[PDB]
Amino acid sequence: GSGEPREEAGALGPAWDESQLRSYSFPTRPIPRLSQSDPRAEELIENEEPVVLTDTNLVYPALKWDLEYLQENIGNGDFSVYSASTHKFLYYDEKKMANFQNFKPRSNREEMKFHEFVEKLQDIQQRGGEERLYLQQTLNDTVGRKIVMDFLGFNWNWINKQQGKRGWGQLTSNLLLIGMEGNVTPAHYDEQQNFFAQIKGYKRCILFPPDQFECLYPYPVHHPCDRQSQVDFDNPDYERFPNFQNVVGYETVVGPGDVLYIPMYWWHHIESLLNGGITITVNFWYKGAPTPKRIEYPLKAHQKVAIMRNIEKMLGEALGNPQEVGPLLNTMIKGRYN
Amino acid sequence: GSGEPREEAGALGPAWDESQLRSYSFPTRPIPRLSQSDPRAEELIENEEPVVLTDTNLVYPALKWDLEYLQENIGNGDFSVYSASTHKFLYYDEKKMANFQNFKPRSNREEMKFHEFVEKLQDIQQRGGEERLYLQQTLNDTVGRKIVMDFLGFNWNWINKQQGKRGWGQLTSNLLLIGMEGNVTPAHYDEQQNFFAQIKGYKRCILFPPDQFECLYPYPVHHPCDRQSQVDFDNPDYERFPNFQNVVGYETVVGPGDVLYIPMYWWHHIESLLNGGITITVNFWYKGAPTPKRIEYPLKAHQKVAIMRNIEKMLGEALGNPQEVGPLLNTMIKGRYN
Amino acid sequence: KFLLDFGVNVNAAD
Amino acid sequence: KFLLDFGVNVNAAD
Numbered sequence: 209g210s211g212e213p214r215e216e217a218g219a220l221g222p223a224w225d226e227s228q229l230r231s232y233s234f235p236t237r238p239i240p241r242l243s244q245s246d247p248r249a250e251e252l253i254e255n256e257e258p259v260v261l262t263d264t265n266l267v268y269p270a271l272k273w274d275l276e277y278l279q280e281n282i283g284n285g286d287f288s289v290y291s292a293s294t295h296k297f298l299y300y301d302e303k304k305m306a307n308f309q310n311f312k313p314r315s316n317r318e319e320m321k322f323h324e325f326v327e328k329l330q331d332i333q334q335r336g337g338e339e340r341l342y343l344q345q346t347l348n349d350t351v352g353r354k355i356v357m358d359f360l361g362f363n364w365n366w367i368n369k370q371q372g373k374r375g376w377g378q379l380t381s382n383l384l385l386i387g388m389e390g391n392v393t394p395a396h397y398d399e400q401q402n403f404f405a406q407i408k409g410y411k412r413c414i415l416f417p418p419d420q421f422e423c424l425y426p427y428p429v430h431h432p433c434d435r436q437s438q439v440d441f442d443n444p445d446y447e448r449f450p451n452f453q454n455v456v457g458y459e460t461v462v463g464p465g466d467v468l469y470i471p472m473y474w475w476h477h478i479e480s481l482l483n484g485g486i487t488i489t490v491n492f493w494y495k496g497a498p499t500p501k502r503i504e505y506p507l508k509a510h511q512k513v514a515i516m517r518n519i520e521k522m523l524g525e526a527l528g529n530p531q532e533v534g535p536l537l538n539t540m541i542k543g544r545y546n
Numbered sequence: 547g548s549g550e551p552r553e554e555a556g557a558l559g560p561a562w563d564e565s566q567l568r569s570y571s572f573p574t575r576p577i578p579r580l581s582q583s584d585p586r587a588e589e590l591i592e593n594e595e596p597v598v599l600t601d602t603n604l605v606y607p608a609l610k611w612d613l614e615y616l617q618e619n620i621g622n623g624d625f626s627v628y629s630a631s632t633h634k635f636l637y638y639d640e641k642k643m644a645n646f647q648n649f650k651p652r653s654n655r656e657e658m659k660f661h662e663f664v665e666k667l668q669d670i671q672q673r674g675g676e677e678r679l680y681l682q683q684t685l686n687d688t689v690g691r692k693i694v695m696d697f698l699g700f701n702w703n704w705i706n707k708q709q710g711k712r713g714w715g716q717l718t719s720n721l722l723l724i725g726m727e728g729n730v731t732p733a734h735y736d737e738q739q740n741f742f743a744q745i746k747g748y749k750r751c752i753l754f755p756p757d758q759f760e761c762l763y764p765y766p767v768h769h770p771c772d773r774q775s776q777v778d779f780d781n782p783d784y785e786r787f788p789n790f791q792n793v794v795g796y797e798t799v800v801g802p803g804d805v806l807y808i809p810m811y812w813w814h815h816i817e818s819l820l821n822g823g824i825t826i827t828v829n830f831w832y833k834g835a836p837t838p839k840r841i842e843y844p845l846k847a848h849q850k851v852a853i854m855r856n857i858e859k860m861l862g863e864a865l866g867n868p869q870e871v872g873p874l875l876n877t878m879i880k881g882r883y884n
Numbered sequence: 885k886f887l888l889d890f891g892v893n894v895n896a897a898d
Numbered sequence: 899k900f901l902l903d904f905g906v907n908v909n910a911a912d
């Protein structure tokens with residue numbers, strides 16, 4: 209699992225304790241925590257396996273960020289804020305909601321100014337409501353001068369070298385994430401390479417390798433929850449998802465100053481520690497390296513995941529309707545391949 | 547079913563009787579028998595539905611063909627002859643046998659001269675052996691002068707008009723089929739448009755529309771028995787093939803002078819009547835019309851069959867190995883689309 | 885498009 | 899070939 213909690217310097221006590229972690233049905237083994245100068249860390253990144261780097265200084269300027277500082281300096285732009293009644297903030301793609309009319313999300317998106325977010329958050333705490341908020345917004349040019357300055361002070365030298373060494377594509381975005389204690393982002397995989405930079409508070413990250421596809425049961429590609437697991441971690445339905453009983457995860461708790469490499473196609477479940485206050489994270493999403501000219505057989509798991517996504521997409525467009533994908537695939541396999 | 551047997555002219559009695567038909571688990575309704583001048587016959591062909599045409603004169607010159615005439619005139623070329631110990635002559639593609647080493651066929655192919663075929667056939671009858679033979683050979687330029695003459699006398703005017711009216715591609719081949727009484731070609735579909743011209747003896751043809759794909763369980767595309775049904779008609783395994791209990795067929799008995807239109811992708815099971823002597827048939831296989839510029843949704847069943855074949859092919863080549871197609875498809879659908 | 889394309893395979897040797 | 903191609907979809911709006 210996460211292991212013995214780290215001791216904060218100056219004898220300030222344990223950073224967190226196991227009682228701040230939610231309880232799940234599967235075993236986990238810890239993600240390595242290493243210096244960015246450790247050759248083993250380069251070896252993990254090169255091999256597209258997760259690693260927590262403890263001393264990158266990737267977002268050193270931002271470690272002073274809290275709500276007051278951000279409210280004062282982050283500008284007058286609109287911020288996407290998600291609202292839910294449960295701790296689970298399952299992501300949904302708005303463009304695809306037309307395909308499935310029977311999908312009604314359990315979280316709602318609302319655009320607001322930063323001070324409005326701080327206000328709603330302040331308001332909920334005052335009256336101890338159960339509503340939960342999660343701000344997720346990509347950093348853009350509308351931020352104010354001091355945030356620009358902080359952003360410019362990130363460790364571009366280090367990360368640019370990484371981008372170059374791995375042959376990755378361009379940085380596509382930086383997502384600012386601000387959450388309430390207890391918030392969960394359920395298990396999903398992203399199609400970009402991600403350096404997850406923790407800034408404030410603590411997040412437990414549980415990762416699963418691409419080869420566990422069969423255990424995690426993603427939604428259909430056309431569904432709004434494409435790339436998310438259908439399994440409810442709190443109450444797993446083993447009758448529909450029997451192989452979730454075989455899932456094994458790589459887990460860690462990141463705190464201020466840590467950077468977690470989440471390789472492309474790796475599943476990740478991310479939770480802000482219970483009773484840990486608000487969390488702040490900034491991610492760094494890069495397009496993956498181009499497909500190689502020469503393909504080595506047999507293919508890696510993430511290549512097979514890519515093939516399956518493309519089959520699902522092609523069939524949706526060929527049949528003229530994504531709801532026909534399932535019946536055709538079943539008709540294709542029943543009594544033939546199963 | 548086939549209906550009341552036809553009465554042969556000059557009061558020569560029933561052409562056949564129901565006791566010459568094998569018994570199967572499913573219901574059937576008869577294929578219409580009509581004149582080629584009947585507008586309903588054009589309407590069936592145009593709509594790619596089967597019809598028996600009784601007066602095309604398509605192979606009128608060949609109606610005098612028997613073994614002695616063919617032996618005397620069909621030349622010194624090699625003829626492919628299949629040999630089996632059962633009545634079922636399941637087709638297998640030799641090129642694909644490398645993909646599945648665990649497939650050992652129940653019929654063997656042997657090349658021989660026509661007189662050798664007649665000899666083996668004569669020999670088996672003399673000693674009442676149980677071996678069965680089925681000659682299946684495409685007509686080629688090596689045939690002798692009188693067969694050329696007969697071939698030239700086929701009703702090209704009529705069939706060429708059909709080829710033109712339907713927009714079909716080229717005639718790809720004429721298959722000569724000579725079988726022993728009781729021989730069965732198990733259910734399969736072909737990817738070409740077929741005019742089946744009966745010459746000698748009687749064959750019961752049972753056809754199933756493309757939309758019955760789900761009931762007939764074809765082998766995987768990479769398997770040597772691609773396009774053949776896995777179901778054993780004599781002993782259907784309803785546990786593996788439950789929807790074979792829903793299959794309904796269109797059936798007819800063709801005799802000398804009849805021509806049966808077997809539309810592309812229609813399943814057909816063909817049996818030479820028990821105790822009916824040898825059968826002779828010549829087929830006429832045409833490439834189907836090009837795919838239309840504008841596609842109408844939803845697609846026809848045979849278009850979906852074409853899509854499924856292409857998915858199976860693409861995955862075989864992408865994974866580098868056809869035996870991985872099944873596991874990927876299952877992993878793609880379990881807990882997702884089923 | 886590509887998916888709709890069909891071949892010419894029959895129960896005989898090419 | 900075409901099948902191996904990947905996108906850039908993440909848990910955020912394009």
Ligand SMILES: O=C(O)CNC(=O)C(=O)O
Pocket residue numbers: 385392393398402404476478479489491909
């Ligand atoms: O931090 C969270 O709650 C979710 N983040 C991600 O899924 C990600 O960065 O890819």
Ligand SMILES: O=C(O)CNC(=O)C(=O)O
Pocket residue numbers: 723730731736740742814816817827829895
């Ligand atoms: O006649 C037979 O036994 C088999 N013929 C065919 O499958 C055909 O002509 O397409």
Ligand SMILES: [Zn+2]
Pocket residue numbers: 396397398476909
């Ligand atoms: Zn993510």
Ligand SMILES: [Zn+2]
Pocket residue numbers: 734735736814895
């Ligand atoms: Zn056939």
